[PDB]
Design a protein around this ligand. Structure first.
Ligand SMILES: Clc1ccc(OCc2nnn[nH]2)cc1
Ligand SMILES: [Zn+2]
Length: 258
């Protein structure tokens, strides 16, 4: 498979190899703030990243992934809509060619410059590969980025990108603290959905924070110097690696806040 984000292998083509592309619980979606309803039964959200152990940063030809040690309950997400414990495995971003696009989820059809996904798996399923086969296998915490002030907690990430320019490059990336990527508020929207890349599995509880983080133009500019290609191939800038909004179908988006 050679799926990607170009004219010839982009999101409108994915259904031919991945028919679940046209499924009943596909992501991302537009979040209509006037239709999402406050749900007073959501328990509080618990982001417990004090013991997070980052290992490595990888350019996989689709995004860059910061990977963590998930062999024990070191960094976990619990509470909110979630039953049980979800272990942080990695984070990555989706971004645009221009500051006015880049996010996957939209808010009243607004696109942000980028979107951060912190990916966690349900520890009751024992490993990540088993989890992705379950309707409640993953929890992805989504955080919008807007361009304004620099985010200091992002800069260690920006600064290593030069070293993983092309597909298949990785670098050691220890002692990175993902708490530095969080906004002040944990107010969120939640809905059931899917992975936003092939294989597009419908295994995700989405938790999308309402408060964006600000990053500087210089910071997002550096994302856009990455490459989708491997070393020694013609240069294709890693930009616009986002899937557009998919039909909501028979789903409700719940708000944690009034
Ligand atoms: Cl481990 C993993 C890495 C990337 C990835 O990108 C597609 C996606 N992003 N958010 N949900 N699905 C999904 C899972
Ligand atoms: Zn993602």
């Amino acid at each position: 498979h050679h799926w990607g984000y170009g004219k010839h292998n982009g999101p409108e083509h994915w259904h031919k190899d991945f028919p679940i592309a046209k499924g009943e619980r596909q992501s991302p979606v537009d979040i209509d703030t006037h239709t999402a309803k406050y749900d007073p039964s959501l328990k509080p959200l618990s982001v417990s990243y004090d013991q997070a152990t980052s290992l490595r940063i990888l350019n996989n030809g689709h995004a860059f992934n910061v990977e963590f040690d998930d062999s024990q309950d070191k960094a976990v997400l619990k509470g909110g809509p979630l039953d049980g414990t979800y272990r942080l495995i990695q984070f990555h971003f989706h971004w645009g060619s221009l500051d006015g696009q880049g996010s996957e989820h939209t808010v009243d059809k607004k696109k942000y410059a980028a979107e951060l996904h912190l990916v966690h798996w349900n520890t009751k399923y024992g490993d990540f590969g088993k989890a992705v086969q379950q309707p409640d296998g993953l929890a992805v915490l989504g955080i919008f980025l807007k361009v304004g002030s620099a985010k200091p907690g992002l800069q260690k990430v920006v600064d290593v990108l030069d070293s993983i320019k092309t597909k298949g490059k990785s670098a050691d990336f220890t002692n990175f603290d993902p708490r530095g990527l969080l906004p002040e508020s944990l107010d969120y929207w939640t809905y059931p959905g899917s992975l936003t890349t092939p294989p597009l599995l419908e295994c995700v509880t989405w938790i999308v924070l309402k408060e964006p983080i600000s990053v500087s133009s210089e910071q997002v500019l550096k994302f856009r110097k990455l490459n989708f290609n491997g070393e020694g191939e013609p240069e294709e800038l890693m930009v616009d690696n986002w899937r557009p909004a998919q039909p909501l179908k028979n789903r409700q988006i719940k708000a944690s806040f009034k």
